Amino acid sequence: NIEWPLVIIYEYIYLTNYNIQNNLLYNIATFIFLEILLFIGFYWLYINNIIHYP
Amino acid sequence: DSVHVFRPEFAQGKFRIDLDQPAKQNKLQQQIYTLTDDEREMYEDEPYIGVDHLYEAHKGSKENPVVVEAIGVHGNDVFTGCLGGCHKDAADAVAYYTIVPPNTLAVCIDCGIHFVARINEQLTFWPDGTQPWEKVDFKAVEGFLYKHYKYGSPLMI
Amino acid sequence: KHPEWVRTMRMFHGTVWRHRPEFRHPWFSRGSRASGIIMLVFGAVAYGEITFGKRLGGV
Amino acid sequence: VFPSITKPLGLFKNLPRQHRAARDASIWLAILTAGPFGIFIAFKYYADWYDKKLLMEYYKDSIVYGETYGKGKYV
Amino acid sequence: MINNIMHMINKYTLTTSHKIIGILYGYMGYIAGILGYIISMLIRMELNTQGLAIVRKVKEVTIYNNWITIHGLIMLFVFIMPVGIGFYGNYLIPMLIGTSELSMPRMNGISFWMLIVGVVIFVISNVLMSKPISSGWTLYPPLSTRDADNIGVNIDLSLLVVHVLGISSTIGSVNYITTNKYNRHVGLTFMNINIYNFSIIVTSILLIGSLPILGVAITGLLLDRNINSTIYDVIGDPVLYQHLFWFFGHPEVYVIILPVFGLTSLILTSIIHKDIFGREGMMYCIISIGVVGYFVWAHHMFTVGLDIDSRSYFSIATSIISIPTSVKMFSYINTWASGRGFRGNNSSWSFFSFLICFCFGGFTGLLLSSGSLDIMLHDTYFVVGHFHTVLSLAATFGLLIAHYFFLPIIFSYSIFESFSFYHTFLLLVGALLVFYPMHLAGLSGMARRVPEYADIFIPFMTVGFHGTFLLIFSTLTFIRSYFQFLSHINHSNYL
Amino acid sequence: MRYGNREIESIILFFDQTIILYTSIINALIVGIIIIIRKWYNRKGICNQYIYHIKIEVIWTILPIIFLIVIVLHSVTVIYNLEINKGTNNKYINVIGNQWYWIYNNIESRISSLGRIILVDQPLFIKANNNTHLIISSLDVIHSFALPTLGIKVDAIPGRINNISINGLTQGLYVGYCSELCGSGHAFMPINLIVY
Amino acid sequence: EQKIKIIDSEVISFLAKEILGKLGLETTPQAARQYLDSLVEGAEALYAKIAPVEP
Amino acid sequence: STVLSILGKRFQRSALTPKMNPFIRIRCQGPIEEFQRGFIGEFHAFALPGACMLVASCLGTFHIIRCLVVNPELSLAKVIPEILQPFTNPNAQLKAADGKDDDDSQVPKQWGMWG
Amino acid sequence: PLVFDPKRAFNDEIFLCCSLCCIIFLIFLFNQYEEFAHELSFDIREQFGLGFYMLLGLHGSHVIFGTIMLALLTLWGAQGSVGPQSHALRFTSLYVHL
Amino acid sequence: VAKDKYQLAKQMAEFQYKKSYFEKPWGYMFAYYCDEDRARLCGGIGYVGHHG
Ligand code: HEA
Ligand code: HEA
Ligand SMILES: CCCCCCCCCCCCCCCCCC(=O)OC[C@H](COP(=O)(O)OCCN)OC(=O)CCCCCCCCCCCCCCCCC
Ligand SMILES: CCCCCCCC/C=C\CCCCCCCC(=O)OC[C@H](O)COP(=O)(O)OC[C@H](N)C(=O)O
Ligand SMILES: [Cu+2]
Ligand SMILES: [Cu+2]
Ligand SMILES: [Cu+2]
Ligand SMILES: [Mg+2]
Ligand SMILES: [Zn+2]
């Protein structure tokens, strides 16, 4: 996985503009959303037997 | 009292091409929007401005064609299109595309419009920091253009 | 003399141009393809061992 | 079709026509949603009323539910 | 030559080109479909015959259970999504919005090879290892976790296969959304994009929201098996597992179906020489079906002991989702009218069959929506008839429309219309003889996932036998037709 | 011919109503499609401009709405009708679902050799015209007590005690199934109920 | 039905009135319509005298 | 043979002069505006599908809230920080009718209908 | 020539902030590991214990990934490669806030 | 646009010449092009004769 930072550096130096930056930022947002959903699923797992008081 | 220097943006290549000529590149990548349903209703009942349209030659005549410009390689066929409904009898549901030879008079016999799709190649200085900062003359450019015409040049991909 | 300035111009004026940034570093690419082959071999061996019930350590 | 409810009521008169039409669309969306909810809520409350009526007319003379179901106190 | 061999391998392994990845997705999808069809033929031969003719033991019915589970998984996750979404999604989406490649080019290759590792693990676990998983495609615990016949690492490898398939689908979904949002040519607004693109976008939104929950459920199964926890054991909630799984489950079926609608609309515009009737309505109905599908998941759980108010709510929500599909069907029917669709075209006749079979399947599934009436139809062959007259008679025929349309464009050879007509007609008749009887067998009371049935259900399975023979004929015709497609002439003389 | 319950009678009549509505809609669409196809194949009635009609679209999206509210109301009432008998009973019967046999009040019911797949050696007896409560559960895996001829299908889940109400009116033996994949002997785990 | 917005109608009216005054016609908008319709009338006679071209 | 008729020769169906539909420029358009132009603004096709989406969402939210309000088993007693906990009564169903199971009509029965 | 400059690196705000954040993240990880082993009595093989530990383990994994990101951003900020508008900085900020 | 009747007669003569010498040639060329496209797509290559 060290290949990602290298290609990232050499592509930012050469291939970058606002269209590319917007694409990348939107992808970052979607990834953050996926992580939030993962946490929601695990909280569902945790609180299933706790909200049901009896 | 102190001196501040803002950190410049060092990126070259596509970014420096964009920042050298922001008008042309923005023109290339600027989204424009079409009318919604209520806007179409509000536009279809707007008035003409003057009686010129009854006398002049419309935009898209055999003598006043619609000239459009794409970027690409010399001689490559140009992709152009309508948004539909340039005529009452022409479809308007969706955009209709066209492949046409460059620098030739074409006629759409759906709407009846004459157009001049043509190509301008985006030949630009190799963006590696050696670009010129002051007015340049025709000699070095002459050499580069001669080489491009005779052999071709790489693509910025 | 800013390090970012030097790094950019070196990427353009101090190295042989490679169409692939991973190839801009020769030995790392070697290591990465070696890792790919290693993972292939590991997967094949693990499949062989788990199915047949013998773990290759006794032979 | 969906005529613009705000025009015959004089609402959002300071907005451009596009945004006024957007408000009209929002109002119509609000109306279309409230229909089925109203129908089902009306049916449910009618069912509760009818159950109260039945429990009144069946457990009127009962000795076990003559004061709770008969009177409707805790139907 | 070593150079040529390495060039080919690198061409198909280092690629990040949408067209190449699309054809790879299509090829893998067709292969998985054929494997699933073979397994289904084994299942049908087990059902068609009396006295456990194939397994010959009651102790060996775990073989039949493995068959049903792997058939379900292969046909759902490895056949119809790689073909419906992966193949035409990568090949066409950038082309229709006039761009070069999808955003994040590398993630596309990552997605395809994640699919491949999933298929490899699945096949090696369920073919080359003893006693595979035998719990249906819905891996309900405690059967999946606490069971004598499910103790080997094959079960765990199958669960990890589900994980990798989910990862691949999420990557594809994110890539599709991002590419459609930002990479449209100048002058093309978001809602004027091709209808197939919008269906792909909504499918992607569906996958993003629901897959992490399935990941959590499958990790729960793995932990129960290995860490010996009680998440779903007697001190746990198998109902919790079901809630999570089905929160993923129904969005999955709508993900499967919507791209078929998009493809059908696109191909119709192409082959009838007329625009879609009510394009805006069809797009809005697509998005409405996508959104409504997230609120109905528990209509698969009317018998586990839900609260009565929840049962009422889920029946209501299922009806709500029924509405927009009807709108779409009417739009299709009116689109075909006043057109000039080709009268000798496998695409045209496949569209007819798709429309009819989907309406029938929708009605049968609308019967199941009612909670009360689902008391008599849960876990019978009525449900199998439903989701096979939808999946195997509507989604499949949508992909056949796409197949008989795009082959002359991808390869540049016409299509043998008479041969293809034999294939399609026999596929239609053979399937209708297998699945239709199931409905009346479900009402009569036959249970699903059983290899041996009571003597009262003979006629249904005789008709199924007839249908299975016709299906074998049809699929052989299909594969032979494709082989003949890429082969030059074999006879030639002088007249 | 008797129904053997009133819950099942209600379910059957609701099913019949839905069948009537769906067959009417199917006939209407069949007539429309027949006309369209007959015109199409003969190459008659072609119009490229017919790609929209606002009033038709609004009407055809309104009609399914008003014909589905009736169905939903009827379904909800049928559900609550199924569940209203709870509390009016005087007998409790406990059912345990084991691996390929049932247990009724600590008595084991297993499939018999006298019947192929439908008979067991120990039925479950309930009096006719007598509300009863079944307390169903399982010990190892998920089964499903399925007697749909009396309108009953209750999943027996380990560690989850389900409670259902049963009331038979016709005397005789009712044959049901396990209706949930429990393993190898899933197809040979029937249910027998004697209403006497 | 076409809707046309007459820009600078005051200047247009002034110029039209002066044109009509020069031609010795009434300076009223109806007179302008009558004159423009008289300009284009009588074309059939001129059409009838056109000799056909060679095939 | 009137001037307008002549000027009307280029505005008949046969020889109508073509006219291309125009674009517009929007200085700033976020996703919300996109919606306002994409879905809203077509409120003859978006009306009832959007209504179905809203009805589904509202019904789901209402069901959740109603359950959290009236269901006897559920309780936000161990779910919410202690500062807000004194507003929760988790054992209410076990305390109805003084805890004695001898008189229905004294124990609440939370059903939508036909309780 | 390209030579690392500790003076400029320490006179840069991004390098300091990312290093401090990475240090605090490591402290948090060590503290949370110290309460998982020698503080609690219930293990991951219980009813509440399992759910609680799954939640905190997922959070700890995300914290480890965030620590890696902060270390990478510290490395890039030391070299002077991180600008004000860096999407790397945006991603790390959003991830840490999440 | 012709304004007086003399311009109308001039444009009528021009139209007659153009019709004899520039428009009918265009019409016949286009008709041939359409038939030639049909022939190119005929013979089992494309879907000519399936509708229309
Ligand atoms: C997309 C999903 C999909 C597809 C295509 C199919 C296709 C078929 N399925 Fe099945 N099936 C399921 C999904 C699918 N199935 C699921 C999810 C289950 C439940 C598993 C469970 O119960 O646990 C199931 C269960 C199931 C059973 C359960 C038996 C039992 O439970 O008692 C049976 C038996 O009758 C059956 C039969 C068939 C048959 C005969 C075909 C086909 O032979 C009929 C149509 C054949 C086709 C020709 C399609 C194959 C296509 C190819 C040839 C690839 C070429 C590509 C294209 C044509 C585009 N399926
Ligand atoms: C792509 C596949 C696909 C599609 C599109 C659907 C669509 C629908 N499905 Fe289903 N379904 C499955 C795949 C699919 N399903 C699978 C694989 C299973 C089994 C999972 C498992 O248990 O193994 C399943 C199981 C399943 C069940 C489980 C029954 C049981 O398990 O107890 C139910 C019941 O609620 C259901 C309902 C529906 C409904 C109500 C629709 C609706 O979308 C259909 C709506 C369509 C229409 C209604 C047609 C349009 C009608 C008209 C033209 C107008 C008529 C209108 C009025 C009368 C108002 N599906
Ligand atoms: C978020 C989700 C929240 C949870 C969900 C909550 C609930 C959802 C919605 C609830 C409302 C559903 C529909 C309610 C109406 C049906 C109940 C009702 O009105 O019952 C009254 C009546 C009882 O009368 P009964 O006892 O039979 O006779 C006594 C003397 N004759 O009933 C009967 O007679 C019953 C017999 C008929 C049953 C079939 C359907 C009838 C529906 C309407 C009945 C009344 C007719 C009025 C309408 C006019 C029709 C032309
Ligand atoms: C317009 C677009 C399509 C609309 C959908 C139509 C399609 C047909 C499908 C469905 C029809 C409409 C869908 C909407 C469903 C409406 C049903 C609904 O929420 O009941 C409301 C509920 O009974 C009311 O209970 P309430 O809380 O007042 O009282 C209880 C308790 N005593 C309490 O303490 O309060
Ligand atoms: Cu579903
Ligand atoms: Cu069983
Ligand atoms: Cu069973
Ligand atoms: Mg079941
Ligand atoms: Zn045009």
mmCIF file of C-alpha atoms in Angstrom, chain E residues 50-52 58-62 65 68 134-136 140-143 146-147 149 232-239 242 272-279 281 302-306 308-309 311-312 315-316 319-320 322-323 326-327 330-331 333-334 336-343 348-349 352 355-356 359-360 363-364 366-367 369-380 382 443 445-457, chain F residues 8 10-12 14-16 18-19 21-23 25-26 29 32-33 36-37 39-54 56-57 59-69 71-84 86 99-100 116-118 138-142 144 146-160 162-164 176-188:
data_model
loop_
_atom_site.group_PDB
_atom_site.id
_atom_site.type_symbol
_atom_site.label_atom_id
_atom_site.label_comp_id
_atom_site.label_asym_id
_atom_site.label_seq_id
_atom_site.Cartn_x
_atom_site.Cartn_y
_atom_site.Cartn_z
ATOM 1 C CA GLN E 50 -39.275 -40.123 -6.653
ATOM 2 C CA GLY E 51 -37.389 -41.917 -3.910
ATOM 3 C CA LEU E 52 -34.358 -39.624 -3.577
ATOM 4 C CA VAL E 58 -31.884 -39.044 3.933
ATOM 5 C CA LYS E 59 -28.511 -38.578 5.630
ATOM 6 C CA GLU E 60 -27.138 -37.107 2.378
ATOM 7 C CA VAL E 61 -29.765 -34.421 1.783
ATOM 8 C CA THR E 62 -27.082 -31.944 2.833
ATOM 9 C CA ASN E 65 -29.127 -28.164 0.586
ATOM 10 C CA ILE E 68 -29.903 -24.798 -3.341
ATOM 11 C CA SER E 134 -26.071 -26.059 3.570
ATOM 12 C CA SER E 135 -28.245 -23.253 4.935
ATOM 13 C CA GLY E 136 -29.907 -21.592 1.936
ATOM 14 C CA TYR E 140 -30.021 -17.996 9.024
ATOM 15 C CA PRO E 141 -28.481 -18.895 12.383
ATOM 16 C CA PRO E 142 -28.249 -21.049 14.396
ATOM 17 C CA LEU E 143 -28.264 -23.357 11.356
ATOM 18 C CA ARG E 146 -24.431 -24.146 15.512
ATOM 19 C CA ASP E 147 -24.953 -27.190 13.314
ATOM 20 C CA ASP E 149 -23.053 -30.419 9.184
ATOM 21 C CA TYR E 232 -27.533 -15.394 17.568
ATOM 22 C CA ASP E 233 -27.563 -18.449 19.858
ATOM 23 C CA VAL E 234 -30.226 -19.301 22.446
ATOM 24 C CA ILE E 235 -29.026 -16.299 24.473
ATOM 25 C CA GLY E 236 -28.990 -14.236 21.276
ATOM 26 C CA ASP E 237 -31.411 -12.896 18.654
ATOM 27 C CA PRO E 238 -31.604 -14.825 15.387
ATOM 28 C CA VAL E 239 -34.311 -12.277 14.692
ATOM 29 C CA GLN E 242 -32.736 -11.537 10.140
ATOM 30 C CA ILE E 272 -38.608 1.763 -31.945
ATOM 31 C CA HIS E 273 -37.348 5.062 -33.397
ATOM 32 C CA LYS E 274 -39.383 7.070 -30.893
ATOM 33 C CA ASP E 275 -38.592 8.639 -27.544
ATOM 34 C CA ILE E 276 -39.769 7.269 -24.216
ATOM 35 C CA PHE E 277 -43.355 8.175 -23.369
ATOM 36 C CA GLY E 278 -43.088 10.222 -20.194
ATOM 37 C CA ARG E 279 -39.334 10.126 -19.705
ATOM 38 C CA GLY E 281 -42.216 10.219 -15.159
ATOM 39 C CA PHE E 302 -44.222 -11.661 8.855
ATOM 40 C CA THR E 303 -44.074 -15.007 10.704
ATOM 41 C CA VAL E 304 -41.096 -14.536 13.053
ATOM 42 C CA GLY E 305 -43.347 -12.823 15.596
ATOM 43 C CA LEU E 306 -43.393 -9.135 14.741
ATOM 44 C CA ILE E 308 -49.050 -6.427 14.990
ATOM 45 C CA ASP E 309 -48.697 -2.699 14.320
ATOM 46 C CA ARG E 311 -47.029 -5.984 10.414
ATOM 47 C CA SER E 312 -49.682 -3.461 9.417
ATOM 48 C CA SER E 315 -47.969 -4.241 4.448
ATOM 49 C CA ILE E 316 -48.827 -0.554 3.947
ATOM 50 C CA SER E 319 -48.387 -1.271 -1.264
ATOM 51 C CA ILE E 320 -46.817 2.185 -1.448
ATOM 52 C CA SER E 322 -46.260 -1.117 -5.618
ATOM 53 C CA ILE E 323 -47.648 2.165 -6.976
ATOM 54 C CA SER E 326 -47.446 0.306 -12.063
ATOM 55 C CA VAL E 327 -46.742 3.809 -13.340
ATOM 56 C CA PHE E 330 -48.108 1.893 -18.116
ATOM 57 C CA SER E 331 -45.349 4.145 -19.446
ATOM 58 C CA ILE E 333 -47.052 0.051 -22.744
ATOM 59 C CA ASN E 334 -47.722 3.543 -24.081
ATOM 60 C CA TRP E 336 -44.435 0.833 -27.531
ATOM 61 C CA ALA E 337 -47.630 2.125 -29.146
ATOM 62 C CA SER E 338 -47.224 4.298 -32.249
ATOM 63 C CA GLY E 339 -43.644 3.076 -32.685
ATOM 64 C CA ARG E 340 -41.894 1.272 -35.528
ATOM 65 C CA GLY E 341 -40.239 -1.528 -33.605
ATOM 66 C CA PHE E 342 -38.706 -4.216 -35.779
ATOM 67 C CA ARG E 343 -41.162 -7.074 -36.268
ATOM 68 C CA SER E 348 -38.714 -6.834 -29.618
ATOM 69 C CA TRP E 349 -40.106 -10.213 -28.649
ATOM 70 C CA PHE E 352 -42.847 -8.385 -24.916
ATOM 71 C CA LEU E 355 -43.244 -6.891 -19.841
ATOM 72 C CA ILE E 356 -45.792 -9.688 -19.479
ATOM 73 C CA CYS E 359 -46.483 -7.762 -14.611
ATOM 74 C CA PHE E 360 -47.402 -11.312 -13.575
ATOM 75 C CA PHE E 363 -49.041 -9.148 -9.086
ATOM 76 C CA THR E 364 -48.008 -12.394 -7.391
ATOM 77 C CA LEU E 366 -48.319 -7.940 -4.361
ATOM 78 C CA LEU E 367 -50.424 -10.806 -3.030
ATOM 79 C CA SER E 369 -47.349 -8.094 0.600
ATOM 80 C CA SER E 370 -50.422 -8.420 2.813
ATOM 81 C CA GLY E 371 -49.296 -9.618 6.220
ATOM 82 C CA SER E 372 -52.355 -11.745 6.922
ATOM 83 C CA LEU E 373 -52.310 -13.479 3.552
ATOM 84 C CA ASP E 374 -48.590 -14.074 4.046
ATOM 85 C CA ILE E 375 -49.493 -16.501 6.838
ATOM 86 C CA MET E 376 -50.564 -19.005 4.181
ATOM 87 C CA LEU E 377 -47.808 -18.307 1.633
ATOM 88 C CA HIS E 378 -44.583 -17.957 3.620
ATOM 89 C CA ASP E 379 -41.957 -20.618 2.938
ATOM 90 C CA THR E 380 -44.031 -22.324 0.253
ATOM 91 C CA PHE E 382 -45.579 -19.592 -4.095
ATOM 92 C CA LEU E 443 -51.427 -22.455 -2.402
ATOM 93 C CA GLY E 445 -49.381 -26.151 0.702
ATOM 94 C CA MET E 446 -46.078 -27.481 -0.629
ATOM 95 C CA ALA E 447 -43.051 -26.274 1.310
ATOM 96 C CA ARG E 448 -39.844 -24.993 -0.247
ATOM 97 C CA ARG E 449 -36.285 -26.234 0.242
ATOM 98 C CA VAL E 450 -37.397 -29.881 0.361
ATOM 99 C CA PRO E 451 -36.162 -32.637 -2.004
ATOM 100 C CA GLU E 452 -39.007 -35.070 -1.302
ATOM 101 C CA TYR E 453 -42.693 -34.140 -1.374
ATOM 102 C CA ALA E 454 -45.973 -35.835 -0.543
ATOM 103 C CA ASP E 455 -47.875 -37.785 -3.188
ATOM 104 C CA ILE E 456 -50.478 -35.006 -3.459
ATOM 105 C CA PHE E 457 -48.060 -32.786 -5.437
ATOM 106 C CA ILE F 8 -59.139 -18.895 7.578
ATOM 107 C CA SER F 10 -61.624 -14.282 6.437
ATOM 108 C CA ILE F 11 -58.261 -14.891 4.770
ATOM 109 C CA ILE F 12 -59.913 -16.812 1.928
ATOM 110 C CA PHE F 14 -59.780 -11.385 1.248
ATOM 111 C CA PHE F 15 -57.774 -13.516 -1.180
ATOM 112 C CA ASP F 16 -60.828 -13.824 -3.428
ATOM 113 C CA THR F 18 -57.737 -9.439 -4.440
ATOM 114 C CA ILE F 19 -58.033 -12.080 -7.163
ATOM 115 C CA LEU F 21 -59.385 -6.963 -8.717
ATOM 116 C CA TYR F 22 -56.174 -8.310 -10.243
ATOM 117 C CA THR F 23 -58.000 -10.317 -12.911
ATOM 118 C CA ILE F 25 -56.886 -5.197 -14.285
ATOM 119 C CA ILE F 26 -55.236 -7.998 -16.254
ATOM 120 C CA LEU F 29 -54.438 -4.492 -19.975
ATOM 121 C CA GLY F 32 -55.298 -2.651 -24.573
ATOM 122 C CA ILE F 33 -52.209 -4.629 -25.549
ATOM 123 C CA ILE F 36 -51.838 -1.969 -29.731
ATOM 124 C CA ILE F 37 -50.097 -5.072 -31.080
ATOM 125 C CA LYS F 39 -52.128 -2.104 -35.022
ATOM 126 C CA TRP F 40 -48.340 -2.345 -34.705
ATOM 127 C CA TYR F 41 -47.718 -5.563 -36.609
ATOM 128 C CA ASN F 42 -49.880 -4.429 -39.529
ATOM 129 C CA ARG F 43 -47.935 -1.141 -39.699
ATOM 130 C CA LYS F 44 -50.901 1.110 -38.942
ATOM 131 C CA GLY F 45 -51.209 4.068 -36.627
ATOM 132 C CA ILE F 46 -47.692 5.510 -36.432
ATOM 133 C CA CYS F 47 -47.023 8.807 -34.655
ATOM 134 C CA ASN F 48 -43.594 9.966 -33.492
ATOM 135 C CA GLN F 49 -44.950 12.970 -31.574
ATOM 136 C CA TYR F 50 -47.025 10.892 -29.137
ATOM 137 C CA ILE F 51 -44.453 10.910 -26.354
ATOM 138 C CA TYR F 52 -46.477 12.718 -23.696
ATOM 139 C CA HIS F 53 -49.972 13.278 -22.363
ATOM 140 C CA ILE F 54 -50.209 15.060 -19.022
ATOM 141 C CA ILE F 56 -53.484 10.596 -19.053
ATOM 142 C CA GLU F 57 -50.382 10.220 -16.889
ATOM 143 C CA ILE F 59 -55.130 9.807 -14.211
ATOM 144 C CA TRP F 60 -53.266 6.523 -14.579
ATOM 145 C CA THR F 61 -51.181 7.284 -11.504
ATOM 146 C CA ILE F 62 -54.260 8.330 -9.520
ATOM 147 C CA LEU F 63 -56.274 5.198 -10.286
ATOM 148 C CA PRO F 64 -53.889 2.647 -8.697
ATOM 149 C CA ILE F 65 -53.855 4.736 -5.516
ATOM 150 C CA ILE F 66 -57.596 4.683 -4.850
ATOM 151 C CA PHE F 67 -57.952 0.973 -5.672
ATOM 152 C CA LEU F 68 -55.108 0.037 -3.311
ATOM 153 C CA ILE F 69 -56.344 1.857 -0.206
ATOM 154 C CA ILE F 71 -57.045 -3.523 -0.319
ATOM 155 C CA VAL F 72 -54.768 -2.195 2.418
ATOM 156 C CA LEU F 73 -57.704 -1.485 4.736
ATOM 157 C CA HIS F 74 -59.076 -4.979 4.183
ATOM 158 C CA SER F 75 -55.661 -6.538 4.847
ATOM 159 C CA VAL F 76 -55.162 -4.630 8.098
ATOM 160 C CA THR F 77 -58.607 -5.637 9.329
ATOM 161 C CA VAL F 78 -57.891 -9.275 8.491
ATOM 162 C CA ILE F 79 -54.672 -9.117 10.524
ATOM 163 C CA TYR F 80 -56.401 -7.737 13.583
ATOM 164 C CA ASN F 81 -59.219 -10.254 13.163
ATOM 165 C CA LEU F 82 -56.634 -13.030 13.236
ATOM 166 C CA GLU F 83 -55.227 -11.695 16.497
ATOM 167 C CA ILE F 84 -58.366 -10.775 18.504
ATOM 168 C CA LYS F 86 -56.152 -13.887 22.477
ATOM 169 C CA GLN F 99 -34.215 -31.685 15.304
ATOM 170 C CA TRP F 100 -36.710 -33.463 13.046
ATOM 171 C CA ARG F 116 -45.384 -41.681 3.484
ATOM 172 C CA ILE F 117 -44.505 -38.143 4.613
ATOM 173 C CA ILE F 118 -47.751 -36.842 6.092
ATOM 174 C CA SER F 138 -37.398 -24.483 19.636
ATOM 175 C CA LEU F 139 -34.344 -26.008 21.276
ATOM 176 C CA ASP F 140 -31.618 -26.111 18.603
ATOM 177 C CA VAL F 141 -32.494 -24.364 15.312
ATOM 178 C CA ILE F 142 -35.352 -22.452 13.707
ATOM 179 C CA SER F 144 -41.869 -23.243 11.684
ATOM 180 C CA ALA F 146 -47.117 -24.500 9.816
ATOM 181 C CA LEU F 147 -50.829 -25.373 9.815
ATOM 182 C CA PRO F 148 -52.074 -22.937 7.159
ATOM 183 C CA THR F 149 -55.444 -24.694 6.795
ATOM 184 C CA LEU F 150 -56.287 -23.149 10.177
ATOM 185 C CA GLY F 151 -54.460 -19.929 9.324
ATOM 186 C CA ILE F 152 -51.446 -20.606 11.559
ATOM 187 C CA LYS F 153 -47.750 -20.297 10.748
ATOM 188 C CA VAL F 154 -45.508 -19.562 13.733
ATOM 189 C CA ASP F 155 -41.718 -19.640 13.593
ATOM 190 C CA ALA F 156 -40.261 -21.648 16.470
ATOM 191 C CA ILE F 157 -36.992 -19.811 17.148
ATOM 192 C CA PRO F 158 -34.484 -20.850 19.847
ATOM 193 C CA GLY F 159 -34.793 -18.634 22.897
ATOM 194 C CA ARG F 160 -37.871 -16.788 21.593
ATOM 195 C CA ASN F 162 -43.961 -17.236 20.466
ATOM 196 C CA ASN F 163 -47.602 -17.244 21.532
ATOM 197 C CA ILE F 164 -50.431 -17.948 19.097
ATOM 198 C CA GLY F 176 -48.842 -29.364 8.443
ATOM 199 C CA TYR F 177 -45.130 -28.954 7.911
ATOM 200 C CA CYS F 178 -41.953 -27.450 9.324
ATOM 201 C CA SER F 179 -41.798 -24.616 6.762
ATOM 202 C CA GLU F 180 -38.253 -23.621 7.709
ATOM 203 C CA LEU F 181 -34.960 -25.163 6.619
ATOM 204 C CA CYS F 182 -33.679 -27.066 9.658
ATOM 205 C CA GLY F 183 -31.226 -29.485 8.031
ATOM 206 C CA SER F 184 -31.283 -32.951 6.497
ATOM 207 C CA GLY F 185 -34.610 -34.155 7.867
ATOM 208 C CA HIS F 186 -36.476 -30.955 7.096
ATOM 209 C CA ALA F 187 -38.725 -32.691 4.563
ATOM 210 C CA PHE F 188 -39.666 -35.429 7.065
#
